[PDB]
Design an enzyme around this catalytic site. Structure first.
Site: not given
Ligand code: HEA
Ligand code: HEA
Ligand code: CU
Ligand code: TGL
Ligand code: PEK
Ligand code: PEK
Ligand code: PSC
Ligand code: PGV
Ligand code: PGV
Ligand code: PGV
Ligand code: DMU
Ligand code: CHD
Ligand code: CHD
Ligand code: CHD
Ligand code: CUA
Ligand code: MG
Ligand code: NA
Lengths: 84, 46, 259, 79, 227, 514, 58, 79
Positions: F61, F91, F126, F156-157, F240, F242, F244, F255, F290-291, F316, F319, F438
């Site tokens: 998934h 292009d 993953w 590819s990327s 991490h 990734e 972003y 935007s 932090h992970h 952030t 923005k 999890r």
């Molecule tokens: C789109 C993807 C995305 C993005 C953008 C972010 C953004 C952030 N993530 Fe998240 N993060 C994930 C995807 C993402 N994360 C995933 C996939 C995992 C789990 C991976 C795994 O284990 O499988 C994860 C896990 C994860 C962890 C690990 C937790 C754990 O495993 O125990 C932590 C730890 O610090 C963290 C922190 C953050 C923070 C601080 C941001 C910051 O960038 C967010 C900043 C944004 C704001 C704060 C909001 C807007 C701000 C304002 C309105 C201003 C005012 C705010 C303040 C004064 C606070 N993330």
């Molecule tokens: C981009 C990343 C992404 C997205 C969109 C989602 C979407 C969803 N995920 Fe997630 N999920 C992950 C990334 C994502 N997930 C990751 C990184 C993990 C951790 C894996 C791990 O632990 O190893 C995870 C784990 C995870 C778990 C935890 C499993 C566990 O710990 O046992 C669960 C549980 O409910 C879950 C549920 C769902 C559900 C119900 C949705 C639903 O919201 C989905 C609804 C459908 C959509 C939003 C897709 C729509 C998009 C399109 C179809 C494209 C359309 C085409 C055009 C517009 C051109 N996800």
């Molecule tokens: Cu991170």
């Protein structure tokens, strides 16, 4: 640093050729002299079946699965010791 | 040279909306169905 | 007609054959590692070679023969090569990170020391030092080759380039011999792991780099390069310096400091 | 004698969450001391402290593996 | 343990978990304030026929929305780091217990004086005694003395696992070849549950942790009898 | 002609179309997998089997949603389609290499499917951490096919990154500085730089796992002096950046969408937006640990990572407030795209805020590896990334196809999805705070209510996905051809009509230097 | 050797409508057909291998 | 017992002309051993080898200065 020579008035082809034959190749010739001197087969150490060496978690995809890719009978013992 | 314009800059045809519905159904349906059948595959091995 | 200086490339089959060759090589490695067969791998390596050969052949046709490499196009290729080398640097960085991680905190299984108990490192003052003089020397000869080309000197460009290539081959032969002679192997714990994977990927890059230089040598023999336009040679030289710098870090880190 | 040990006390040399070296060090120390005393004609009771500490901190399987290796002659540590 | 329909943290059993509860209340208020402020502002921007579409100057309002968040982040970091360092304080334990993770159960070792050790398996659902919790009970509990500073050492003999007890604020990864330390101190007697917190294969969901906190006296007798 | 056009392409538009198609298909696969996850957790007990088949599903998934759906759509799809048009380029810099970045994806996807077909699949998460992912706990080809899938997606990327950076730096009109390019173009370049620097480290790391599994190396095996934690560092150093990479192109599209539907000629504080994305990109490389707050690191290392991680909230925040400031004083057009963007602003903020909660290593002890993390990332990914993709898709669909969608149906689609994702993920916060781990196929009885509600929400999302397929069909079926688009003076990509001709900008734009 | 680049320039600029990868002549055609055949055949073969590996051989 | 010492033998750890650390190491070793034995209730005779080695190698003034410093509490080495 600045080396110990000089030129710099204009670093061109003649200068780089000068460096190739006057510094670079001579250095390679010296190191080749040194190496083909300090060589000679050093006596292989006694074998001790250390557990952190001769690792085998899965057999190699070649030969009998127990010999490393560039296995040298003379210096590379198997997990059970040197070969015959 | 190639065909240009609406409905011509794509790898599939939109000439017939019903043939198109069949295409899209197979396309998106095969994707959605694949995981279910792989799960079935894994369960039927042991 | 276009009124910009960029290159609109003819539809090509190589991106597809290249992608498929990647599938065949990975599929192939899997078949080899698990189902004891090299058939897929062999086909993959073959189509990969064929793809690269034809793709780069076409780039030469588009530039030397068709004149599509205007200054703008060449400028883009420069950025492309620099970016590629940057990603290669980061790839090696991961291997250096693995090396330092293991060597700076030797675990109890190693005897809590580095090098591990039972490991007898090569003498850095012997073939490894020779290898170092070989690559540094080739860095000087390739610079002479570059200046000769710019100065319009065909004979000396060929001469310098030939020397550069011979040195790269010499390094490869020396390394091959060192691999055979080494008392330790890739299976000898983390020391053998870090040593062979890092120097192994480096040796691969030396082979790729030498091949690139050989391509340039033959394009030079065929008068492809002008005294002012010869990006292929420049890219090969940048790549060659990269290979040289990575070796210096390997030498200082693994062979010297790590012994 | 100067004992009455509950458990291994805090050791400033190993103040962090990773305690692997603490166990290792004490295991080494005990066997080095035990070897010195058994050699020069002395008593292993002086090595007691290290024995208690490593026994307290080290997983049984680790001590068991290390013991097997010292007997096999494949213990990588210096004793 | 967690109870039906629970919204927040399990009740704190150690002074440190109590500390985390108050820090979380502090942080959550900021999260609610900022998120509702943003939702409010969105609605404010969208509910007027009045317009201003010409170029708007930004080097003035950006000071505000740079300094403010900076201050807020410091207001979160201060207590967060105070707690962090507090958890690292030298405390000098009265007992050391080790736990080794396995696929899929935990083994414990109390080797300060005697060489006591045992395995701890989840009681199969088919085997639960009436009133017992599904997926949470184990055959052999981790008997420990209450109101005492205990040093827990965690490791594993195979893949990664993670030893956790939410009510005590504990989670320490079990890594093969490594001995991780954490300290435990229960303010009360009782049964405290936790579950393996690092994916370890087939039965990752089924290898719970159960702590039994009793007074020192009972701890000792138990010690002896478990020889 | 068909093969030359679609298999041998050297056209950025057609290649972008291929990416959009591939990503749409991948999205269906990822949605199916998410349904299997929630079906398993929908009621207490075991539905499919033990944690192995369950985690093979969870692992796939994630890989599918991240590597095959989000990245291909945002970067390969919207990136290829829009970047050249927004800078008036004929292009991409390397049009042929661009085609290879696309064609490496189907093989990459095939390897992922192969890994789940053979043996018992790769039920590793993953993150693929050893020793579980090693040759003893996961013997057989599964994990090896997974590593190879990542290698191909990686190449590819990386090639795609080289192409985007070169195009953006080298192919703008002579008079246009980098400070005159649209924010989406900025978002793509920064994303490309992150990819170029991070993927090679991942590649190094998974290659070491490959050798540990097949060549007897011991990088992560303590028996040989290795360390499983080394893998975590190498993975997360890429991991991490990734996340972003997954959200930056989203920020770029947001935007454009907010500016466009606010009837504005430009986004508020352009230079602040560029600064913010650059800062986020930079900070994203120094916070990876932090992970790993529970692996047993020194307290000072943990205090540093807590602190560094929170700083990202500052850029952030600039923005978020800038998007609100762009709405300010606007003649708001309540189009479906605008709705997706407004939902993004709010929902992404919530997800970012819970990220800040997790940044605190003290609290993370208790929240790590629980559903609080799953809640956090699904708000930023399943609501943030996905809403940006949906918004961009409905906004630009008329441009790519030449046809208009039915706005009412699109607004219905948004409403259903909004309810679905919130019902699915909001309750997961409670499950996390209360301790649900999890990667579990079953849970203690107390967690039943929230898991039941979460699984029902996932079905609502499924209904939205099915509706979206119908909506796209209806647009192509009715054939309402685009005539005019407003605001072309500040949206160059629309200036060549809908769809633009195969070759655009054969004669470059004229831009004075003054 | 003598400089024959001008000859090659003439050949590759000849207005015959051929894509650069086939403009060299009949050999390009052959090499292309060999490459593509190995690629597609090899892909079919890999699919077959996947089908084989997908099932247990107990 | 196990002695019959003529002079300090070659020590592979200090194979060079500079022998400063050889003297220092053995001086430290003796006093560390002597401290361990006098502490845990044992005999200093086990420390004999180190005493003989350092006495043979170390200049009288060095030993004399180090001794004075250990007494004064200013000995920089760890014992
Ligand atoms: C789109 C993807 C995305 C993005 C953008 C972010 C953004 C952030 N993530 Fe998240 N993060 C994930 C995807 C993402 N994360 C995933 C996939 C995992 C789990 C991976 C795994 O284990 O499988 C994860 C896990 C994860 C962890 C690990 C937790 C754990 O495993 O125990 C932590 C730890 O610090 C963290 C922190 C953050 C923070 C601080 C941001 C910051 O960038 C967010 C900043 C944004 C704001 C704060 C909001 C807007 C701000 C304002 C309105 C201003 C005012 C705010 C303040 C004064 C606070 N993330
Ligand atoms: C981009 C990343 C992404 C997205 C969109 C989602 C979407 C969803 N995920 Fe997630 N999920 C992950 C990334 C994502 N997930 C990751 C990184 C993990 C951790 C894996 C791990 O632990 O190893 C995870 C784990 C995870 C778990 C935890 C499993 C566990 O710990 O046992 C669960 C549980 O409910 C879950 C549920 C769902 C559900 C119900 C949705 C639903 O919201 C989905 C609804 C459908 C959509 C939003 C897709 C729509 C998009 C399109 C179809 C494209 C359309 C085409 C055009 C517009 C051109 N996800
Ligand atoms: Cu991170
Ligand atoms: C779906 C299940 C709902 C169950 C509800 C509670 C039942 C309580 C019984 C009975 C209640 C009383 C008795 C028990 C008290 C327990 C106190 C406790 O231990 O305390 C801690 C607990 C409980 O916290 C609470 O005290 C509950 C807070 C609920 C906030 C809900 C906002 C909901 C919005 C719309 C509905 C939900 C879906 C959409 C959510 C969209 C994102 C918010 O755990 C949390 O921290 C959970 C939340 C995690 C953080 C999310 C942060 C951002 C959220 C919303 C911002 C919206 C701003 C605009 C305003 C809101 C705009 C929409
Ligand atoms: C002469 C110097 C130049 C080195 C390379 C030349 C020949 C080897 C063949 C391919 C090597 C290419 C890259 C390196 C990969 C693994 C390390 C190999 C380095 C090497 O060659 O190490 C040898 C091990 O060989 C082994 O297992 C090697 C087994 C061969 C199988 C290769 C395994 C393929 C795995 C490749 C992974 C590809 C992923 C790359 C991704 C790139 C980014 C996406 C060392 O020999 P030994 O007997 O153990 O010790 C010597 C004792 N006398
Ligand atoms: C312990 C670790 C161990 C591992 C270490 C291993 C190896 C060590 C590392 C490196 C050594 C290797 C090789 C070096 C040899 C040659 C490299 C080639 C450089 C060259 O020769 O460059 C030339 C000029 O400089 C130029 O490119 C300048 C223009 C550059 C453009 C590309 C960069 C764009 C990418 C992103 C931009 C970054 C932005 C910075 C600001 C960010 C703030 C945070 C070519 O010209 P051009 O491109 O047309 O530019 C026009 C500008 N004059
Ligand atoms: C942790 C969270 C932080 C919370 C956030 C706090 C938000 C800040 C709150 C208030 C900001 C006050 C700014 C004051 C600017 C005055 C507005 C004005 O009126 O706008 C213009 C000024 O230009 C200009 O600054 C350009 C136009 C206005 C510039 C500023 C407007 C944007 C304000 C932000 C929009 C709301 C988003 C808030 C984000 C949370 C008007 O121009 P003039 O009158 O000269 O010409 C008109 C002709 N006359 C002379 C005949 C009248
Ligand atoms: C770089 C400029 C910015 C400056 C900021 C500083 C950041 C990094 C540089 C510092 C690296 C050297 C520090 C080593 C000193 C400590 C020795 C040590 O021991 O550290 C070790 C790991 O260091 C290791 O591999 C360290 C391995 C390196 C990790 C850093 C990752 C960044 C690399 C990517 C950057 C690309 C650069 C391109 C190259 C030109 C092990 O860890 P401990 O926790 O001790 O475990 C022991 C336990 O038993 C007890 O607790
Ligand atoms: C046993 C050996 C097999 C091993 C496998 C790899 C084998 C060989 C790789 C060697 C690379 C050969 C590259 C040859 C490129 C020839 C085409 C060329 O060099 O093309 C030039 C453009 O540069 C261009 O595209 C520049 C092209 C850049 C290519 C460089 C990429 C290196 C590839 C590395 C791949 C592996 C990565 C690492 C693995 C972990 C053409 O322009 P000019 O030179 O200015 O000419 C024009 C003048 O004549 C006008 O008057
Ligand atoms: C487990 C095993 C995994 C194996 C995965 C293998 C993946 C693919 C294998 C087959 C790919 C080889 C085929 C040749 C590719 C050459 C690309 C190239 O040379 O691309 C060039 C651009 O990149 C430039 O310059 C500079 C960039 C040069 C890039 C060279 C490509 C090498 C591909 C490998 C990359 C590995 C990543 C390295 C980091 C770990 C030319 O651009 P085009 O668009 O063609 O033309 C533009 C025209 O104007 C030219 O006249
Ligand atoms: C990113 C770029 C990297 C791409 C992947 C690199 C590909 C490496 C190919 C290695 O292939 C080989 O495999 C073999 C294993 O089958 C060898 O034969 C051998 O193996 C045997 C088969 O069992 C024996 O019969 C022989 O003695 C012999 O050594 C062998 O020589 C070698 O060519
Ligand atoms: C034939 C050519 C002269 C220029 C021309 O082709 O007209 C000469 C000049 C310099 C070249 C030579 C250079 O002097 C370098 C090499 C030196 C020799 O030891 C072997 C061949 C060698 C590799 C070259 C072969 C030779 O045929 C070249 C290619
Ligand atoms: C100087 C530079 C570009 C200005 C321009 O040439 O137009 C601008 C763009 C964004 C600005 C930054 C952002 O607005 C965020 C910060 C806002 C605070 O008001 C000052 C520092 C602050 C960090 C700014 C410093 C500086 O004014 C920046 C970096
Ligand atoms: C996590 C990584 C080690 C990875 C590994 O073990 O391989 C290490 C290497 C260098 C460390 C950094 C440097 O030692 C410098 C800083 C030292 C401070 O005590 C904490 C933060 C600080 C910024 C460190 C954080 C972290 O522990 C780093 C980044
Ligand atoms: Cu043990 Cu999960
Ligand atoms: Mg974890
Ligand atoms: Na279930």
């Amino acid at each position: 640093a600045s080396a110990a020579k000089g030129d710099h008035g204009g670093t061109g082809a003649r200068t780089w050729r000068f460096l190739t034959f006057g510094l670079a190749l001579p250095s390679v010739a010296l190191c080749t002299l040194n190496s083909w001197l300090h060589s000679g087969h050093r006596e292989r150490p006694a074998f001790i079946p250390y557990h952190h060496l001769r690792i085998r978690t899965k057999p190699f995809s070649w030969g009998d699965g127990n010999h490393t890719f560039f296995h040298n009978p003379r210096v590379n013992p198997l997990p059970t010791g040197y070969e015959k | 040279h190639y065909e240009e314009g609406p409905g011509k800059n794509i790898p599939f045809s939109v000439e017939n909306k019903w043939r198109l519905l069949a295409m899209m159904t197979l396309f998106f349906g095969s994707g959605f169905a694949a995981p279910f059948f792989i799960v079935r595959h894994q369960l039927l091995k042991k | 007609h276009q009124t910009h200086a960029y290159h609109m490339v003819n539809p090509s089959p190589w991106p597809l054959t290249g992608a498929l060759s990647a599938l065949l090589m990975t599929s192939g490695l899997t078949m080899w590692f698990h189902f004891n067969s090299m058939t897929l791998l062999m086909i993959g390596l073959t189509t990969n070679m064929l793809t690269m050969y034809q793709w780069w052949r076409d780039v030469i046709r588009e530039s030397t023969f068709q004149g599509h490499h205007t200054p703008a196009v060449q400028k883009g290729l420069r950025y492309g090569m620099i970016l590629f080398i940057i990603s290669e640097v980061l790839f090696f960085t991961g291997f250096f990170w693995a090396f330092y991680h293991s060597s700076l905190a030797p675990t109890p299984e190693l005897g809590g020391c580095w090098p591990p108990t039972g490991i007898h490192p090569l003498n850095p003052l012997e073939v490894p030092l020779l290898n170092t003089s070989v690559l540094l020397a080739s860095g000087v000869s390739i610079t002479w080759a570059h200046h000769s080309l710019m100065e319009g000197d065909r004979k000396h460009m060929l001469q310098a380039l030939f020397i550069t290539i011979t040195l790269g081959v010499y390094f490869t032969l020396l390394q091959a011999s060192e691999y055979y002679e080494a008392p330790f192997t890739i299976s000898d714990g983390v020391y053998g792991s870090t040593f062979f994977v890092a120097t192994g990927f480096h040796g691969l890059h030396v082979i790729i780099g030498s091949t690139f230089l050989i391509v340039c040598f033959f394009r030079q023999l065929k008068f492809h390069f002008t005294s002012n336009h010869h990006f292929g040679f420049e890219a090969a030289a940048w790549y060659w310096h990269f290979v040289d710098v990575v070796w210096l870090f390997l030498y200082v880190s693994i062979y010297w400091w790590g012994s | 004698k100067i004992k009455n040990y509950q458990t291994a006390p805090f050791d400033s040399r190993f103040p962090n969450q990773n305690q692997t070296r603490n166990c290792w060090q004490n295991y080494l120390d005990f066997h080095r001391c035990e070897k010195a005393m058994t050699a020069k004609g002395g008593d292993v009771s002086v090595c007691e402290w290290y024995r208690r500490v490593y026994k307290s901190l080290c997983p049984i399987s680790w001590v068991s593996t290390w013991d097997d290796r010292r007997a096999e002659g494949t213990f990588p540590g210096k004793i | 343990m967690a109870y039906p329909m629970q919204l927040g943290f399990q009740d704190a059993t150690s002074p440190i978990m109590e500390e985390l509860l108050h820090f979380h209340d502090h942080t959550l208020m900021i999260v609610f304030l900022i998120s509702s402020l943003v939702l409010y502002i969105i609605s404010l921007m969208l509910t007027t026929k009045l317009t201003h579409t010409s170029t708007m100057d930004a080097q003035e309002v950006e000071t505000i929305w740079t300094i403010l968040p900076a201050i807020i982040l410091i207001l979160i970091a201060l207590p967060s780091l105070r707690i962090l360092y507090m958890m690292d304080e030298i405390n000098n334990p009265s007992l050391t217990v080790k736990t080794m993770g396995h696929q899929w159960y935990w083994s414990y070792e109390y080797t300060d004086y005697e060489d006591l050790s045992f395995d701890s398996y989840m009681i199969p659902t088919s085997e639960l005694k009436p009133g017992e919790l599904r997926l949470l009970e184990v055959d052999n509990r981790v008997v420990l003395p209450m109101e005492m500073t205990i040093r827990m050492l965690v490791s594993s003999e195979d893949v990664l696992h993670s030893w956790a007890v939410p009510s005590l604020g504990l989670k320490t990864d079990a890594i093969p070849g490594r001995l991780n330390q954490t300290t435990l101190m229960s303010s009360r007697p009782g049964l405290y549950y936790g579950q393996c917190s690092e994916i370890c294969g087939s039965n990752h969901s089924f290898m719970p942790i159960v702590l039994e906190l009793v007074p020192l006296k009972y701890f000792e007798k138990w010690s002896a009898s478990m020889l | 002609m068909f093969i030359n056009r679609w298999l041998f392409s050297t056209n950025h538009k057609d290649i972008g179309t291929l990416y959009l198609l591939f990503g749409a298909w991948a999205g269906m696969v990822g949605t199916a997998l998410s349904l299997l996850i929630r079906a398993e957790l929908g009621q207490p007990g075991t539905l499919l089997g033990d944690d192995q088949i369950y985690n093979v599903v969870v692992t796939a998934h994630a890989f599918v949603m991240i590597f095959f759906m989000v990245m291909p759509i945002m970067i390969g799809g919207f990136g290829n389609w829009l970047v050249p048009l927004m800078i008036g380029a004929p292009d991409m810099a390397f049009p042929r290499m661009n085609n290879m970045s696309f064609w490496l994806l189907p093989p990459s996807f095939l390897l992922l499917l192969a890994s789940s077909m053979v043996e018992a699949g790769a039920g590793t998460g993953w993150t693929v951490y050893p020793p579980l992912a090693g040759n003893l706990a996961h013997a057989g080809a599964s994990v090896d096919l997974t590593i190879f899938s990542l290698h191909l997606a990686g190449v590819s990327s990386i090639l795609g990154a080289i192409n985007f950076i070169t195009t953006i730096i080298n192919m703008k009109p002579p008079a246009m500085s980098q400070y005159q390019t649209p924010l989406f173009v900025w978002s793509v370049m920064i994303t490309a730089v992150l990819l170029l620097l991070s993927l090679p480290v991942l590649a190094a790391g998974i290659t070491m796992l490959l050798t540990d599994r097949n060549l007897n190396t011991t990088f992560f095996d303590p028996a040989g002096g290795g360390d499983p934690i080394l893998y975590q560092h190498l993975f997360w150093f890429f991991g991490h950046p990734e996340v972003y990479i997954l959200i930056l192109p989203g920020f770029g599209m947001i935007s454009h969408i907010v500016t466009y539907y606010s009837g504005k000629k430009e986004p508020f504080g352009y230079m602040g937006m560029v600064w913010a994305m650059m800062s986020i990109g930079f900070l994203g490389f120094i916070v990876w640990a932090h992970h790993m707050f529970t692996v047993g690191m020194d307290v000072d290392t943990r205090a540093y990572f807590t602190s560094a991680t929170m700083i990202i909230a500052i850029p952030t925040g600039v923005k978020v407030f800038s998007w609100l400031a762009t709405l300010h004083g606007g003649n708001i057009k309540w189009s479906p795209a605008m709705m997706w963007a407004l939902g993004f602003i709010f929902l992404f903020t919530v997800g970012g805020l819970t990220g800040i909660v997790l940044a605190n290593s003290s609290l993370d002890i208790v929240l790590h590896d629980t559903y609080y993390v799953v809640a956090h990332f699904h708000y930023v990914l399943s609501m943030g990334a996905v809403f940006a993709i949906m918004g961009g898709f409905v906004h630009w669909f008329p441009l790519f196809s030449g046809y208009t969608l039915n706005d009412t149906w699109a607004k219905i689609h948004f409403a259903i999805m909004f309810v679905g994702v919130n019902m699915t993920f909001f309750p997961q916060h409670f499950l996390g705070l209360s301790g649900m781990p999890r990667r579990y196929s079953d849970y203690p009885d107390a967690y039943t209510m929230w898991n039941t509600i979460s699984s029902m929400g996932s079905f609502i999302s499924l209904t939205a996905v099915m509706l979206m397929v119908f909506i796209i069909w209806e647009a192509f079926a009715s054939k309402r051809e685009v005539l005019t688009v407003d605001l072309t003076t500040t949206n160059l990509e629309w200036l060549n009509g809908c769809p633009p001709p195969y070759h655009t900008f054969e004669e470059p734009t004229y831009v004075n230097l003054k | 050797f003598e400089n024959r680049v001008a000859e090659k320039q003439k050949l590759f600029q000849e207005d015959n409508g051929l894509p650069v990868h086939l403009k060299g002549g009949a050999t390009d055609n052959i090499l292309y057909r060999v490459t593509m055949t190995l690629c597609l055949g090899g892909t079919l073969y890999s699919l077959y291998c996947l089908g084989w590996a997908s099932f247990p051989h107990k």
